[PDB]
Design a protein around this ligand. Structure first.
Ligand SMILES: CCCCCCCCCCCCCCCCCC(=O)OC[C@H](COP(=O)(O)O)OC(=O)CCCCCCCCCCCCCCCCC
Ligand SMILES: CCCCCCCCCCCCCCCCCC(=O)OC[C@H](COP(=O)(O)O)OC(=O)CCCCCCCCCCCCCCCCC
Ligand SMILES: CC(C)CCC[C@@H](C)[C@H]1CC[C@H]2[C@@H]3CC=C4C[C@@H](OC(=O)CCC(=O)O)CC[C@]4(C)[C@H]3CC[C@]12C
Ligand SMILES: CC(C)CCC[C@@H](C)[C@H]1CC[C@H]2[C@@H]3CC=C4C[C@@H](OC(=O)CCC(=O)O)CC[C@]4(C)[C@H]3CC[C@]12C
Ligand code: NA
Ligand code: NA
Lengths: 529, 529
């Protein structure tokens, strides 16, 4: 009896000791570098899902596993842990720390609740719609980095105004996370695999006639985005709240009048705030300026300030979104938090004292999620180890004996495999590798390309199970009120739903506007006929 | 009156606003990329010395300055902020956090004080000798990362046993910092520019006869190290303590018997500790194993375990010192801090609870100096911007019209310039660039190489003014009780002392054992005669 409670109390130590031993037949029986990288991937996924170690400690495992298995040496694996996206997260969290420190987050959360109201499922739908609209035009990482702290502030105000809590918290966190990545598929400039697909079409089949452009991508990918967003909202609401759809929408007495009480509490808390202080006004202006600079830097469909000022030899911007975030975060240290804020010096009773800035270093040190910086870096290191061991090439060359399958099932199997492989590795390198293989495979069996290239492009964006794929999937672990098992349990079904929605969009309304029953003349080579 | 105290209270804001404006004639009047990188260097040095901003905030300035001046784009400047040396610092600080959390640091500090005694100048000399002996054989960063927390613990125990304090603290911090870099010059494998010099001699002048080897480097560079260490001890003791040399050595009554009181207090505090706990024994064993693995990984003069296991195609180690540090730090999370430590669960009154590890994440998050990680990264970014703008090449090509100078003054001017340029940039890239220029310059004027190549190699190691050069110079800012102006004030004279000691060693006992009055036959080309 107690000898089983001793083993159940020690379960993390038993997992950490026994899971690496049980996977040893994969590197022992198959002596290859692809097998070693697969060992590292499966081990890190199991350690993240069981939470046997902290997240940031599991994230440091490529630093010891990749040099001593021979994939890549220590100096080359160490420069993967701070890229530009990781710095964009750091810079956005500086602004969020400043917003919370001067009580602007309470004012924003109370205005949001006074506009939308206190009803769980419509409030979640409103956050999902705003996040998806923002990630059509700016980066997915920046959208996540400004939308996650706002949703956390709104949830805290809603839970204090009514005095379940944890399940509504998990639902709103995952809804913002998934909306930031779902909304990026709708525009051609919304996420990087879309531009990789346009470049590979123009490179592999010249004289295609610019068949993939802004309007033809929007006409195909906007209804897919809207259908997938509504299905994601419905499934997350079912999984975390009940099957009721009546207390979810707050309908009926014993719900209608216990919401007027919380709404009156919210009105009282909003009235109890005074006028805006100097720090709140300065941070509001800087926040608006940061979002406006993110819209106009490199919009893709017209020419931004990052193309006019600061171009490279190809006309692209040398300045990125992380640069603008670090710029605003640095400016916050040099602006005084109160302008005639001259305090008499207590340890020097003849001098005055200047006020602190909108940010000081000890607040930033206490409030920054350093473990998420390490988690994002560990994901990047896993992806580079996957592309340097030859595992991505080995997984790409498995899609070639998929030829002996009828055509609507080829795309479904392909989308399943591409979403699953993207859960381990990156998504831009997979789109770089997989598209020539698929283009040759479709040229072999007299099938139109973009019948297999479009589902492969759309499937790299819809991966929802692990924090290693797509930096939004890491950013929701910042406030520490969500487990990885919640994300995997919600994301496993959402991958399958995304696969089915892609199949509906490619077998209906994708066939007319791309002429997918034709085998066009710009795809003919000397091998076809 | 008060209108001057308002301006004096606001002096950091005035510095931050006015220093970038006053330096604008350098990029405006000289429109070049070398001038832009020099602007960034001078601006960051002024912001660090005035402490107008926090150290880690000034360290983030290459991320905004280098893409928007056109030196290097955002994605390439962002991957400079986490290299292997920065990770070695992180991994060593994990072990130091574990040592302090379980009160092993108090036991170590009390044993050190019971052995050495309570006398300031001999205790400082003992720390300097141990640090210099350790950095002859292992990395300078690892030596600094384990010696700085121990010295801090010893200073805290000494100041509590006597109840000035701050000046003795600054003296011991700078002494450990400077000893870690001074001791690395004595062996051929002690620091990386020495091996760069041996490789460049073997590459530029083949059939030299292996004139630079282990024994001939040790015979030249060991007395230089000992003389420079004694002069550094004397100068730091003069600058931070008094000119007395009698209260510094604790000699004479009113000092002799107020030290027996503190020594008896130290004996009482050591006796009041009990036996060692389980956590203290586990951390002591892991600390000894980590130091023994650092000695034997790649010793240079024999074959280590990193050459036998884990070699690359050239036989070098794919595993580094940072890998071993991260390995030990990861192991500390999985070892229980008490073995039958089964606590009855308070929030679940039918189950037990396993103990926490030797490290948990919230302790690491509260205690890690994240700002020093950012400071080391900002230094690496400054160095890469210096080598990509062409500023290092431009500073190298200035040493060529030094030909019209008598020979003992060429080496002195050269060592001054090389130490000053190393204060801004790195030291391995400067040794890579400057040695062919100096070798051709010495072939032009019938002068022996290694009369100019040896002072250039030795001068890149002795730079003591800024945290950007040599990662030990950043690691002493971890405990926040030292300003950059203290380091600059102490290091400015120590650079000149190092230059004079190098001149003494190259004009005495370097002339016999390298035959520096000969112009040998392996340096002749078709241009000489
Ligand atoms: C589509 C539904 C969306 C529901 C809302 C979910 C997303 C909310 C995102 C909020 C983003 C805030 C950005 C930061 C603003 C900085 C400026 C600032 O703080 O100034 C002080 C400002 C005013 O403070 P005050 O002076 O104390 O009132 O605070 C604010 O937070 C700005 C005002 C709130 C804006 C909410 C907009 C919501 C989106 C549209 C909702 C449409 C609902 C449709 C149904 C309506 C029925 C009537
Ligand atoms: C040359 C002068 C050097 C002066 C000392 C400055 C540098 C001190 C570095 C200390 C490094 C400690 C490494 C970590 C040890 C882990 C093991 C551990 O904690 O085990 C428990 C161990 C014993 O604890 P206990 O059981 O409570 O006594 O604690 C220790 O800290 C180890 C014992 C102290 C070692 C000090 C050695 C100092 C270097 C040689 C000094 C020579 C002085 C010449 C004049 C002598 C006059 C009589
Ligand atoms: C949490 C910390 C304590 C690490 C936990 C241990 C395991 C997760 C790792 C660390 C070291 C790894 C080993 C490092 C090196 C090797 C040798 C490697 O040997 C080969 O087959 C290479 C053959 C060749 O190079 O010719 C096989 C995998 C293995 C055993 C690895 C298996 C997985 C190990 C034991
Ligand atoms: C602390 C934060 C608010 C930054 C503080 C401002 C300055 C430290 C920096 C930031 C932007 C910098 C500018 C960025 C770009 C340029 C354009 C650059 O233009 C050229 O001469 C390039 C000519 C060419 O490319 O042909 C000259 C330097 C300058 C003014 C830089 C001068 C120094 C500035 C003003
Ligand atoms: Na986007
Ligand atoms: Na060394």
């Amino acid at each position: 009896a107690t000898c089983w409670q001793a083993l159940w109390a020690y379960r993390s130590y038993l997992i950490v000791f026994f899971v690496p031993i049980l996977l040893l037949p994969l590197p022992i029986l198959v002596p290859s570098k692809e097998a070693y990288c697969a060992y590292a991937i499966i081990l890190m996924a199991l350690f993240w899902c069981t939470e046997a170690l902290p997240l940031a400690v599991t994230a440091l495992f490529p630093l010891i596993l990749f040099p001593m298995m021979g994939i890549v040496d220590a100096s080359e694996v160490a420069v993967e842990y701070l890229k530009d996206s990781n710095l964009l997260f750091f810079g956005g969290l500086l602004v969020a720390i400043a917003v919370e420190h001067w009580n602007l987050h309470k004012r924003i959360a109370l205005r949001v609740l006074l506009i939308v109201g206190v009803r769980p499922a419509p409030l979640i739908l409103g956050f999902m719609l705003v996040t998806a609209f923002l990630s059509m035009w700016i980066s997915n990482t920046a959208t996540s980095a400004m939308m996650v702290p706002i949703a956390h502030a709104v949830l805290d105000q809603l839970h204090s105004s009514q005095a379940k809590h944890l399940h509504l918290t998990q639902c709103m966190s995952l809804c913002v996370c998934y909306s930031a990545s779902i909304g990026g598929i709708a525009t051609l400039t919304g996420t990087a695999p879309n531009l990789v697909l346009q470049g590979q079409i123009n490179s592999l089949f010249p004289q295609n006639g610019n068949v993939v452009n802004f309007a033809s991508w929007f006409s195909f990918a906007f209804p897919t985005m809207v259908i997938l967003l509504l299905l994601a909202w419905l499934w997350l609401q079912i999984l975390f709240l009940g099957f009721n759809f009546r207390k979810n929408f707050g309908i009926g007495e014993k719900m209608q009048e216990q919401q007027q009480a919380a709404y009156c509490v919210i009105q009282t808390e909003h009235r109890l705030l005074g006028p805006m202080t100097f720090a709140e006004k300065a941070i509001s202006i800087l926040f608006v300026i940061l979002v406006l600079l993110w819209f106009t830097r490199e919009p893709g469909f017209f020419l931004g300030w990052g193309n006019l000022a600061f171009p490279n030899a190809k006309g692209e911007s040398m300045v990125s979104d992380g640069t603008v975030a670090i710029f605003i975060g640095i400016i916050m240290f040099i602006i005084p938090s109160k302008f005639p804020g001259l305090t008499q010096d207590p340890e020097n009773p003849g001098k005055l004292k200047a006020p602190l800035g909108l940010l000081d270093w000890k607040t930033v040190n206490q409030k920054m999620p350093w473990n998420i910086v390490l988690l994002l870096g560990g994901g990047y290191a896993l992806a580079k180890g996957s592309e340097r061991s030859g595992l991505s090439e080995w997984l790409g060359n498995k899609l070639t004996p998929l030829q002996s399958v009828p055509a609507p099932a080829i795309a479904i199997i392909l989308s399943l495999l591409v979403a699953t492989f993207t859960e381990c590795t990156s998504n831009v390198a997979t789109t770089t590798i997989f598209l020539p293989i698929l283009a040759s495979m479709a040229q072999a069996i007299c099938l139109h390309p973009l019948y297999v290239m479009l589902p492969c492009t759309l499937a790299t964006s819809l991966a929802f199970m692990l924090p290693v794929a797509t930096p939004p999937n890491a950013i929701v672990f910042s406030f520490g009120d969500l487990k990885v098992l919640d994300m995997a349990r919600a994301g496993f079904l959402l991958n399958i739903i995304g696969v089915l929605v892609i199949a509906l969009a490619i077998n209906s309304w994708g066939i007319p506007l791309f002429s997918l029953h034709s085998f066009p003349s710009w795809a003919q080579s000397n091998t076809t006929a």
